Amino acid sequence: FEHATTVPNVPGIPYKALVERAGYAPLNLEITVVSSELTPSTNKEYVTCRFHTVIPSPQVKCCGSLECKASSKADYTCRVFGGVYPFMWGGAQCFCDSENTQLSEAYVEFAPDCTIDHAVALKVHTAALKVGLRIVYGNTTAHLDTFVNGVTPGSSRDLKVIAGPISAAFSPFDHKVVIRKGLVYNYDFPEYGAMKPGAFGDIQASSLDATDIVARTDIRLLKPSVKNIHVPYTQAVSGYEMWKNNSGRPLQETAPFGCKIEVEPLRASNCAYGHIPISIDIPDAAFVRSSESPTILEVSCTVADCIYSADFGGSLTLQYKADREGHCPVHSHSTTAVLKEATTHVTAVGSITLHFSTSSPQANFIVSLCGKKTTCNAECKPPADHIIGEPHKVDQEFQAAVSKTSWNWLLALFGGASSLIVVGLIVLVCSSMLINTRR
Amino acid sequence: FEHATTVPNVPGIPYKALVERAGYAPLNLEITVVSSELTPSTNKEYVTCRFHTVIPSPQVKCCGSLECKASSKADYTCRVFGGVYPFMWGGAQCFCDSENTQLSEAYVEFAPDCTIDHAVALKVHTAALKVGLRIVYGNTTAHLDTFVNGVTPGSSRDLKVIAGPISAAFSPFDHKVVIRKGLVYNYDFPEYGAMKPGAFGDIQASSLDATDIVARTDIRLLKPSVKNIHVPYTQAVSGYEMWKNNSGRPLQETAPFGCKIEVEPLRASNCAYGHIPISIDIPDAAFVRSSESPTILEVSCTVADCIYSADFGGSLTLQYKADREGHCPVHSHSTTAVLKEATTHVTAVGSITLHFSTSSPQANFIVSLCGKKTTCNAECKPPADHIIGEPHKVDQEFQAAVSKTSWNWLLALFGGASSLIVVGLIVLVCSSMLINTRR
């Protein structure tokens, strides 16, 4: 027996329904989204960190001239200079006071601490959502994990669920993302090779230990001007440090819908948004024919004081008459009302006091006990507290979120004009008929 | 000096240009797209192959009763059967022949030969283009590799080149791709977790050695019937084999724009489409002032036989008066005319022969030597040859391929009607004014 529902994607708030096969007693179905993770398609473009400016030892051709070569090292920089006459510790390091050429060499690698203190740049795309569902049917509770796409199934030994597609698509990650020590940033970074010095991504590599590092740190060497041997140079400030200082807030503190961003893999857990359609094929063993579950001759509903709120602040009483003692299920078929209890014991004749929550100023909702209906009508006052630490269990509508007194007043003041214009048109028609007759 | 051109993205076809500085001699430039590599970004969804349906040894409880426990093997299936009374070689493996419960167990794994024969399912994203350029200016040539984005530069020791973006983006790969032994198929595959028996990716895993193998091959155990111990079962055919039989031709033989699809990493090489805007900052040392190179006094063009073929099927002669011997550059300033040679030794008095290719039936193109221009007008015959194994070096322009005779006849036929209607309007006005005067 396939039952199709639209469970709101809100973790921790159970969604209750009643499945009613024609020749069999109704059964209760509680579906709770215990966990839900949305994980995007991810691919590392590169990593980056604070460059270690490695400067090889200078070489001097004492009475000749060197030529600077080329290499594939990250940001290879090399320059040649004329007479230097270097000193080391004695008071001389080359004769030929003229024609004393010198070579200055420099480049950049990853610093030793970059193995952990590094950023990883990523490009993301459409994200599929995976939902963990606890489903209770009749007297059997099952746990499942499934992909919400409408094709990917899940099964628990007799249970058979197909979930999806998600009603509304949403990913808290922009097309380009950065990850640093678990902190996720929605940053736009330079593309692979589109490296700008002095900014994030001044150096890039596909791995920490990779030797094909590409670096561009804007390094310019200077002519040595001091007697002692040394290689002067200036260089753009580490763009990684600049981005670290101006990193802003991570996406953990900015993702909407209260989705907890976690890493390894990058994902958003408990992202409450929209609704998911779920089709469940309940096993035939659970259902029982109507001749066994005690049908109730009649039911009457009396609603006590109620306040429309998030908590189960409303109450009612059902006076029932039945033919046998059983375990009847109770449901609310209205969209703006939910019940704390889904299965209650029933006697031959008696009363059951039950609790419920709503969101409308007036409760005009149909309760159902073992399939028998009763339209509970009441009038709920606004709540006392302003702020609750519990989420709302029912959405706020328009066709029902207007008080009956206000509805009556609005209808009266809007129908007064309609009656007036009808009377005016009647008077005009009567005047026309009179003038036609008496012409 | 920064000079900007729009080089056609056609590897192997040189593009000739002339940098014409205001106060310096013009200098020749030739740009050749030696190689191009359109490489997308890939993420391994999973790997699939021919599954080996391993059936563990059945276990029989003598005449007790077993129970099927849940496991995590790929498409794990377990069943319990009643009285069996198995036979091996003495024909009695169990006492108390009735109520002789047997357990049947089966699951799937990767076949031993899957380490080579296996299909990797990939999702491809926006693809970046990288081009290798050989640029020769004047006498000096250079090789470089650049990313076509309009931001990433190429640097060759004096040369600063900015390439891109592509005029019209193109990626031969669809959203989803499958790679098998180097063969690429743009075949969409079921997402992770969405196994379908008898179809591609019925068995999935993150790696060949990964233990989290997930499969849905629709395997069902059957009750044993023969006396001898054996577990029967039925199972859908390997969907990997079905896809292999119905794989279709690979993307290597159907990728448009004629490029080689390569793997490790996935990419498309030498794919001709669109144009690349390239800006080259030519070093100022290359140029030489016009007072050094000889400037000719008068140059005239006598066009020899010309054929608008796909090759250099045209010749001409330039007679020149000059002041000194030199190495003058030569260029064609029309978009439907290219020249075999870009420079030539020039004497004081004489003439030089030159070769050229065009595509219009007419030649109306401006040649230029050491800067100064000269129009060449000619009529070219259709090519005698029907087919060549050489690409067209230029593109026929919009309505520039219309011959002089065609132009004359069409203009005469339209101007006849135009002059006729003008004459008719003039006659109508004349008659109207004549009547008004004589009214």
Cα angle A87, A91, A95 (rounded to 5 degrees) comes to 75
Q: Are B65 and B209 in contact (CB under 8 A)?
A: no
Give yes or no for B193 touching A (CB within 8 A): yes
CB contact under 8 A, B193 and A152: yes
Following DSSP, what letter does each residue of B75-89 receive, concatenated? T-EEEEE-----BSS
Distance separating alpha carbons of residues A389 and A393, to the nearest angstrom: 12
Distance separating alpha carbons of residues B409 and B417, to the nearest angstrom: 13
Distance separating alpha carbons of residues B193 and B201, to the nearest angstrom: 9
Tokens of B97: 């022949």
Cis bond before residue B14 (omega within 30° of 0): no
Cis bond before residue B391 (omega within 30° of 0): no
- Strands B260-262 and B128-137, by their bridges, are unpaired
Following DSSP, what letter does each residue of B162-226 receive, concatenated? EE---SS---SS-SEEEEETTEEE----PPTT---TTSTTSEEBSSSS-S--EE---EEE----S
Distance separating alpha carbons of residues A358 and A335, to the nearest angstrom: 9
CATH code of the domain in which A349 resides: 2.60.40.350
Residue owning tokens 């008719």:
B424
Following DSSP, what letter does each residue of A343-358 receive, concatenated? B--B-SEEEEEEEEEE
Report how this structure was experimentally obtained. cryo-EM
DSSP state of B58: P
Tokens of A340: 């704390």
Phi, psi of A106 (to 5 degrees): -165, 150
Phi, psi of A360 (to 5 degrees): -100, 155
CB contact under 8 A, A125 and B128: no
Tokens of A299: 């039911």
Cis bond before residue B382 (omega within 30° of 0): no
Give the range of the structural domain holding residue B311, as residue numbers without chain letter. 296-379
Phi, psi of B154 (to 5 degrees): -120, 135
CB contact under 8 A, A149 and B42: no
Tokens of B54: 């391993």
DSSP state of B50: P
Collect all residues of chain A within an 8 Å Cβ-Cβ radius of residue B149.
Answer: 191, 194
Q: Which of residues 116-175 of A touch B (CB under 8 A)?
A: 123, 125, 128, 147, 149, 151-152, 157
Nearest CA in chain B to A152: B194
Residue owning tokens 């049947």:
B104
- Strands B51-54 and B102-110, by their bridges, are antiparallel
Distance separating alpha carbons of residues B133 and A193, to the nearest angstrom: 16
Interface probe, candidates A125, A157, A176, chain B, greatest B C-beta count within 10 A: A125
Tokens of B388: 């060549």
Of A149, A152, A194, Cβ closest to residue B151: A194
Q: Are B10 and B272 in contact (CB under 8 A)?
A: yes
